[PDB]
Amino acid sequence: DIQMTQSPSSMSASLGDRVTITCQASQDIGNNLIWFQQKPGKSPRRMIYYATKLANGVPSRFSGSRSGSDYSLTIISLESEDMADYHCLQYKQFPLTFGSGTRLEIKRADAAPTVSIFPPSTEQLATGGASVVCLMNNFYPRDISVKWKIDGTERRDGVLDSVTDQDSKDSTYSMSSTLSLTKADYESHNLYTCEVVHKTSSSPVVKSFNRNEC
Amino acid sequence: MSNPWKAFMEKYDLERAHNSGIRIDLGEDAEVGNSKYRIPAGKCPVFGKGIVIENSKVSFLTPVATGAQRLKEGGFAFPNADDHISPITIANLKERYKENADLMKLNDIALCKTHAASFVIAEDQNTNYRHPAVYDEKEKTCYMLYLSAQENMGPRYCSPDSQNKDAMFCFKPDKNEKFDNLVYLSKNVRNDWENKCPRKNLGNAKFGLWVDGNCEEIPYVNEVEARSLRECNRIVFEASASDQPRQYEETDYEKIQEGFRQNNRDMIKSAFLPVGASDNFKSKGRGYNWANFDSVNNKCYIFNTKPTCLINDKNFFATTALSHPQEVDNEF
Amino acid sequence: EVQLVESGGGLVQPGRSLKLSCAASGFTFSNYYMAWVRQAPKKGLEWVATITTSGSRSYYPDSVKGRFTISRDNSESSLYLQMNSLESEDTATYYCARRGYGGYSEDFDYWGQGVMVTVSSAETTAPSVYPLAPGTALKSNSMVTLGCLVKGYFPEPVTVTWNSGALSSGVHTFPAVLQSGLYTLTSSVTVPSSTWSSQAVTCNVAHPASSTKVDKKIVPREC
């Protein structure tokens, strides 16, 4: 029952820039605070122990800071291996509680999507279910809007989209929208358009296909 | 009806003020590993007290003899690992707990003990085990004890003129020149000891019992020869409340040594400690803890009944086993 | 130099039990406290349990109290987490982390790789694999993006590769989407056109849960 309030939710930072995550507990923790770096799909790694003591292997750009209830971690000369989630932990009082986590996304030179359209497979149409995919690749920043227009008309239903986690190497994102409908609903229309709206375009990127020509 | 001393004489009812053994402080009971032992549980600091390792040229303050090191090649102290742990300077101690108001208030000795007490795992903190700390006044360096034991001696272990040559780890608690500026703290040491505990030897004064309006005298005493203020203190320290009895043993020695070589934290933590099976060994502070010294005719007067007042006597010195070997106060 | 290799886990229905072992190596086990920590998909870590060097005492939060039990065998250096009468909110990855020791800065220094533990009632459904090939009006270029649609499976995850593993660049397996009580995952692979004419670009998707090894070879759309 020691409320850990790790803020913000996530943050964007450029290279060499400094980033400060501020974890704050309701009651008194001494210097019993741990910063943990967790990288996509991997075990977390200890960064800062006893609130300020930098642990083995952890580079000098990492550092912790106490001031009453508040505690913070700073990465000063930002690298491409700072693209991770950062977690706090109090090991002063039972039960051991962690903060929400903070997603560290790294700012890069903006990039336009590589929009692609995909008509349902003949395999799918044997099932009587027809899914249209529209994946947009290697783009920056993360704010993008995908839109299904069937014969130039709106489609807010039966659409599942899933953004990738920022690429480790080239720092881009990739999104994957899917308009899963019926063979029936599919056959009853000709134009299937997927309109992409990104910071990079001004005028939307729209890749599309027509049903009649396969 | 009534006593116009009492409030001042509070710091001399040691069975309350300290409530533990003095020469041997083993007042608490704590689980260390599967086994349960007995740990220093004394509310007062013991000034000038220390541990001497017989047939050794090594101090008890030197880090523990872990690994390849022969047991007697080391001391009792917690390993050097992070000089911001043991031993730690008052500067670093102040630095370490900088952001706590409640504790930045505490004195050097109490802060030192509070630092030793900090080493627990949050969930297990309910466990009443902590490492005892010893504070050096001249160094202003606080040391952590890995060993809570105080007297491995007697039968199997330490029999006079040893066959085990020097190899045997023989130890006893002593008060002397080396330890003159030292002070043995428990987990329990009160943070307000410069109010509840006896520090200096009361100069040009003597212990007596307050009876029917007049500061009377000591009904029973044991008269022994004392050459100095130190000699008296030293005598009444050996005579004072002591938990582990004279020549006490129950664990093996090579198995205790193995734990040291095999760097086992719990084997070391528990080495040469009596069980919590048993409680009758706890003196609870009752003992021959108080003395008076006739310096003008070299005589030590010890007793097992707490003092309740002082006599204006200029040729005398009132002392307790916790009280400092050298430090004195002729105030009255 | 220090290992924490978890085992056990997988899928189980609610109310049922599961034991997660974690063999430790390279350190004197009996000198350290141990603990388990879990992590829900897209959520923060959660302290699960603690155990003393001896095993004397065990510490659990109200979250999995008396329904979970931590244990160890220091003679044969290994840890355990017996999870009983399981809940669907107990669905997370479990981490054996080396807990500290008072007066030492060992606290959570090393963790285990992790172990996916899945709790739900739903029938372990194998996936339907539809191959994403581009539209018939192919404006032929230098680069082509071919896909793999993995419609309706349960539970997460599916291991997706491109050409038995061989294709590594420009392949993007997007996070799966749960809707209709089933998982829908898409994998993209940006390969040059030059090679899609000379190489048979296959997509290897595999569900351990239903024990599946579907291999879809992406060809051009026709008609």
Author numbering:
A (entry chain B): 1 to 214
B (entry chain A): 51 to 300, 303 to 329, 332 to 386
C (entry chain C): 1 to 52, 52A, 53 to 82, 82A, 82B, 82C, 83 to 100, 100A, ...
Share the article's original sentences:
Apical Membrane Antigen 1 (AMA1), a type 1 transmembrane protein of the Plasmodium parasite, includes an ectodomain, a transmembrane region and a cytoplasmic domain. The ectodomain comprises three domains referred to as Domain 1, Domain 2 and Domain 3. AMA1 appears to be essential for invasion since, for several Plasmodium species, antibodies raised against the ectoplasmic region of the protein have been shown to inhibit invasion, and immunization with AMA1 in animal models protects against infection.
The PkAMA1-Fab R31C2 complex, which crystallized in the space group C2 with one molecule of complex in the asymmetric unit, was refined at 3.1 Å resolution. The Fab fragment binds to the hydrophobic groove of PkAMA1 and makes significant contact with the D2 loop. All three Complementarity-Determining Regions (CDR) of both VH and VL make direct contacts with PkAMA1. The more significant participation of VH is also reflected in the number and nature of the contacts across the interface; for VH there are 116 interatomic distances less than 3.8 Å, of which 22 are polar (including three salt bridges) while for VL there are only 25 contacts, of which two are polar. The largest changes are induced in the PkAMA1 loop Phe169-Asn178, where differences exceed 7 Å at its extremity. A single turn of α-helix is formed from residues Ala172 to Gln175, placing Glu173 and Asp174 in position to form a salt bridge with R31C2 heavy chain residues Arg-H95 and Arg-H56, respectively. The D2 loop makes significant contacts with R31C2 (52 out of 142 interatomic contacts <3.8 Å, including nine hydrogen bonds); it nonetheless preserves the same conformation as found in the unbound PkAMA1. The RON2-binding site is thus inaccessible to the receptor in the presence of R31C2 because interactions with the mAb keep the D2 loop firmly in place as well as blocking access to a large fraction of the hydrophobic groove.
